Design a protein around this ligand. Structure first.
Ligand SMILES: *[C@@H]1O[C@H](CO)[C@@H](O)[C@H](O)[C@H]1NC(C)=O
Ligand SMILES: CS[C@@H]1[C@@H](N)[C@@H](O)[C@@H](O)[C@H]1O
Ligand SMILES: [Zn+2]
Length: 1015
């Protein structure tokens, strides 16, 4: 294994280093507005060294943006694909690249057989080429690496099955900035090349100047370079035709033959295209070749990539003709005029890369190495695209919920082969596809029109219901005596209970377990643990009586705590935000202990009075002017008092002190220790009254944030043996700090209401001497060092926080883990901040044509880990990565992949069993089985099950922490006959494994394995 901590990679371009050196001046470069006037030597190209030009036709098709997926499919994409098929069939020389498999699959399945065959033939013959081959072209900022993989696999599995092709070149022209998570996954999925486009205009200028726009992109910790993937960054402002022929868009626009008038398009530079004729072809070619030779100066080989396309292009037959015929006249002239020394033709993306690497092998060029990312993007001036790190945060949180439910459904159902009538494969395919669709760069980003957001939400809701059905059928099969098991595949044996989605105050969607002497004495509940190690976690359920006790399936008592059910109400009469208690529903909380990738059953039983092993929380309501708060049978009366500072400690864990407004002020780790200042504060950013306005994409604050005026908020303290909390009703946020004996959990019920032109931020203020350094993650995969740059505006110092961020000095670290992607930063030493929601009246002029006014209540979740790090073995000051500790990593897992809870729906579960998976290996804590997926249907003689294994890297801080077991995924199911290492999509076998044993992976590595079973 490579050491990912102690060896700083030597690379030609390291993006943090480059950022520190660059000036970011936005000067007028002339016709290339963000560059300079490119010069070339006409003698560079000659009869023995020609410029090879590949014109690559393409059409960018968003799976939802202004229209829904289906609306675009009906109005545009089905015609584009139908006309591509006809035109490429009839014109053997014409080429076209296609990216979005969600659309292609929808189209292909609707084709008659004769046309399916024609389509297969133009792909087989190389005219139509798939690039990337994912279900979508995903966002790279907010997406979790697990879901980027899921959608890539969904599209490529479809392509292998129906087209018989697996792309090895990736095309990502539209995500708003770029992540090294992409080359990481692609390179482990058989890819050899990738292309990107939306990077900061200053970065394009800088790399262009050094001919570093093509580079071998390796991971920031990779000293050897085995993660490296060849990457091509396009040089200009857009991928449209005006910005792809060369530096001068007034010229390139004249070579977009759809812009002459009849298609309702024109050139903003006020010079139109003209149809190519024998009388103008020479002068037109003079102009175009000069653009091409200018572009070619920015690159190292004699092979030039010229994309030819734009959004939803190549729709009309007459459009295919006008582009093809005019380009063909140009090619015939140029290629026959030796003085140009150019050979130009239509080509595909792969053809481009193959010729580039042929030039490389001939010794004509060597490429620089690069590590780092390409956030935060700005396309011009101070317009930084950090708003979409937060836009539509309800659906951002929904993404992470569905992410986990898809994993749990695939894993629970993977243990068995299912009859087709169970509709398991059907429901799993729907769930994967709707989650995969939402990875689109207008889905999770929150940059789609309101009605499209609705469509993505409805699709995800159906996906959640699909996952629940599969999960609950799987639990029933796994925990029922086989000779008793009698499934109705349409029946609901269990319902899922989820405490944090949609979350209390977002939906009264939690079912109460109804017990009573005259109806039902007891209820079975089951917990699933998708992680491959034993896990204990507190779980809660609503019950109809406070007098409930818990047993395990050996009838051993389990310690439990009952608390009231509190709901917060904005009282339009008294103009206060205050909590109400239920007088008929209560919460019971107990510690569940669940095997690795396993299940554990418990029983809740009512009694007529307080049970021996159940305790009751106290409750203290702090406000002036209190009124009574009855709680039915709950055995402890609520107490009242004026607002005051309070301190809490659960178990032997930290002691937390809170201000009289209910906000954290300090954390004391142990009995002896300092009360370390750690202050939560809520603030608001506004919008500029003159100049550019914030919108779905752009964050353009009118200065630093101002504190939210809190008034005198109502504070509720619940103190229990197992769980305590402080909750406060602030304007727009019910803010909750929950303590279970370790790092607290924070929950914010965020309802920005009708506060127009407002962004609500949650800030942590500490005295940690972090200076200008902080760390944020990329796609939940890795943590990258950030440096706050005062030479850039505030919004440029915002980065994606897809799952966590931290600051540290020599002694102390504070880590905030998230259950949803949001934007954030550290705008001053000792600070962390993360945006909660944003409501914007204005559009930001990128084409969406609306502001963001469709906010809805969202429950954001966090864990907050304050730790001593003076003993941790950390990377050197020059290393671009950072790494979590064990506690911070486990805290992240508790948010992203909590225990699943199932409530038995009927009165009696006959043949019920107490546990599944007690014999599963309990793997080392840094190892995860990210995916478990059965790959075969029940009719296959040879069953195959796929596993993705990911090992993170955790800091060595002096904890001996050992005693675990080797996890060999290939032996998890019986009767193994073969074990293969595969690409991460499972589509190609890479290694036939000795003894049928899947080795564990190295820190920061991910591998896939497929086990084959004869049973
Ligand atoms: C699928 O592609 C491979 C590539 O070598 C080819 O050998 C095989 O015959 C193809 N199967 C078909 C034509 O369906
Ligand atoms: C950023 S403009 C971009 C458009 N190019 C469109 O494809 C959609 O993705 C929108 O967000
Ligand atoms: Zn797009």
């Amino acid at each position: 294994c490579q050491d990912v901590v102690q060896d700083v990679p030597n690379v030609d371009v390291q993006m943090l280093e480059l950022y520190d050196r660059m000036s970011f001046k936005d000067i007028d470069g002339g016709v290339w507005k963000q560059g300079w006037n490119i010069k070339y030597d006409p003698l560079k190209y000659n009869a023995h060294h020609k410029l090879k030009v590949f014109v690559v036709p393409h059409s960018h098709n968003d799976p939802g943006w202004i229209q829904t997926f289906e609306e675009y499919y009906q109005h545009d994409t089905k015609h584009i694909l139908s006309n591509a098929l006809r035109h490429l069939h009839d014109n053997p020389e014409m080429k076209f690249i296609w990216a979005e498999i969600s659309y292609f699959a929808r189209f292909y399945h609707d084709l008659g057989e004769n046309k399916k065959l024609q389509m297969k033939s133009i792909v087989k013959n190389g005219q139509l080429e798939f690039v990337t081959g994912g279900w979508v072209m995903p966002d790279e900022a907010n997406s979790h690496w697990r879901n980027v993989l899921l959608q890539l696999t969904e599209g490529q599995t479809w392509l292998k099955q129906f087209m018989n092709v697996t792309p090895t070149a990736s095309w990502a022209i539209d995500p708003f900035g770029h992540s090294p998570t992409m080359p990481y996954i692609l390179q482990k999925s058989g890819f050899k090349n990738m292309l990107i486009q939306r990077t900061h205009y200053s970065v394009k200028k800088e790399l262009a100047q050094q001919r570093q726009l093509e580079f071998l992109w390796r991971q920031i910790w990779d000293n050897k370079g085995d993660t490296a993937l060849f990457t091509h960054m396009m040089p200009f402002y857009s991928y449209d035709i005006p910005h792809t022929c060369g530096p001068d868009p007034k010229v390139c626009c004249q070579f977009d033959f759809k812009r002459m008038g009849s298609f309702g398009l024109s050139c903003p530079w006020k010079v139109p295209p003209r149809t190519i004729s024998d009388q103008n072809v020479a002068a037109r070619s003079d102009l175009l070749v000069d653009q091409w030779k200018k572009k070619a100066e920015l690159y190292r080989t004699n092979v030039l990539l010229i994309p030819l396309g734009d959004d939803f292009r190549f729709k009309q037959n007459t459009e295919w003709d006008v582009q093809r015929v005019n380009y063909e006249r140009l090619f015939e002239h140029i290629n026959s005029q030796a003085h140009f020394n150019v050979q130009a033709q239509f080509g595909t993306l792969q053809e481009y890369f193959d010729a580039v690497h042929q030039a490389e092998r001939a010794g004509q060029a060597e490429f620089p190495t690069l590590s780092g990312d390409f956030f935060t993007y700005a396309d011009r001036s101070d317009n930084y695209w950090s708003g979409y790190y937060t836009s539509r945060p309800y659906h951002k949180r929904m993404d992470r919920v569905l992410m986990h439910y898809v994993r749990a459904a695939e894993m629970l159902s993977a243990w068995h082969s299912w009859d087709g009538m169970a509709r398991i494969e059907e429901r799993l395919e729907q769930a994967r596809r709707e989650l995969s669709l939402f990875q689109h760069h207008d889905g999770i980003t929150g940059t789609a029109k309101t009605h499209v957001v609705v469509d993505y939400e409805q699709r995800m809701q159906e996906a959640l219901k699909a996952c629940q059905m599969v999960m609950q059928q799987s639990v029933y099969r796994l925990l029922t005596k086989p000779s008793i098991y009698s499934p109705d595949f349409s029946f609901s044996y269990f319902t899922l209970d989820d405490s944090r989605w949609p979350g209390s105050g977002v939906e009264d969607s939690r079912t109460t377990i109804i017990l009573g002497e005259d109806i039902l004495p007891s209820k079975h509940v089951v917990m699933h643990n998708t992680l491959p190690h034993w896990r204990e976690q507190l779980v809660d359920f609503y019950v109809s009586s406070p007098f409930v006790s818990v047993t395990d399936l050996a009838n051993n008592p389990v310690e439990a705590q009952v608390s009231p059910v509190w709901s917060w109400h904005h009282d339009t009469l008294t103009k206060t935000i205050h909590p109400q208690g239920s007088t008929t529903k209560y919460r019971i909380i107990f510690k569940a202990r669940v095997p690795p990738m396993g299940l554990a059953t418990y029983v809740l039983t009512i009694s007529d009075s307080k049970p021996e092993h159940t305790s009751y929380a106290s409750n203290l309501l702090l406000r002036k002017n209190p009124t009574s708060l009855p709680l039915g049978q709950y055995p402890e009366d609520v107490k009242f008092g004026d607002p005051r500072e309070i301190s809490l400690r659960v178990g032997n864990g930290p002691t937390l002190a809170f201000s009289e407004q209910g906000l954290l002020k300090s954390i004391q780790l142990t009995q002896d220790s300092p009360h370390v200042p750690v202050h939560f504060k809520f603030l608001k950013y506004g919008v500029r009254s003159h100049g550019d306005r914030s919108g779905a994409y752009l964050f353009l604050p009118n200065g630093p944030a101002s504190p939210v005026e809190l008034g005198q908020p109502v504070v509720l303290v619940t103190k229990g043996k197992l769980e305590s909390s402080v909750s406060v009703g602030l304007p727009s946020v019910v803010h909750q700090t929950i303590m279970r004996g370790g790092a607290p959990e924070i929950r914010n019920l965020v309802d920005i209401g009708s506060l127009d032109n407002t962004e609500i931020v949650m800030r942590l203020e500490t005295h940690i001497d972090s200076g200008d350094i902080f760390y944020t993650d990329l796609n939940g995969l890795q943590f990258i060092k950030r440096r706050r740059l005062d030479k850039l505006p505030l919004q440029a110092n915002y980065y994606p926080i897809p799952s966590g961020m931290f600051i540290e000095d020599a002694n102390t670290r504070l880590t905030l883990l998230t259950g949803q992607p949001l934007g954030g930063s550290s705008l001053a030493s000792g600070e962390l901040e993360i945006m909660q929601d944003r409501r914007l009246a204005s559009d930001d002029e990128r084409g969406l044509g609306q502001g963001v006014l469709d906010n809805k209540p969202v429950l954001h979740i966090y864990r907050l880990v304050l730790e001593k790090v003076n003993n941790c073995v950390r990377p050197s000051k020059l290393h671009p990565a950072g790494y979590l500790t064990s506690a911070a990593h486990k805290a992240s897992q508790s948010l992203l992949d909590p225990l699943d809870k199932f409530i038995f729906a009927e009165n009696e579960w006959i043949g019920a069993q107490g546990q599944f998976g007690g014999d599963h290996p309990s793997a080392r804590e840094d190892l995860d089985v990210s995916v478990m997926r059965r790959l075969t249907k029940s009719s296959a003689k040879t069953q195959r099950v796929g596993y993705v294994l990911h090992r993170t890297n955790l800091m060595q801080c002096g904890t001996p922490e050992e005693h675990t077991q080797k996890l060999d995924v290939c032996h998890l199911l019986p009767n193994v006959a073969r074990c293969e290492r595969t690409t991460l999509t499972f589509l190609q076998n890479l290694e036939h494994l000795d003894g049928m044993v899947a080795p564990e992976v190295c820190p920061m590595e991910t591998a896939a394995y497929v086990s084959s079973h004869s049973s």
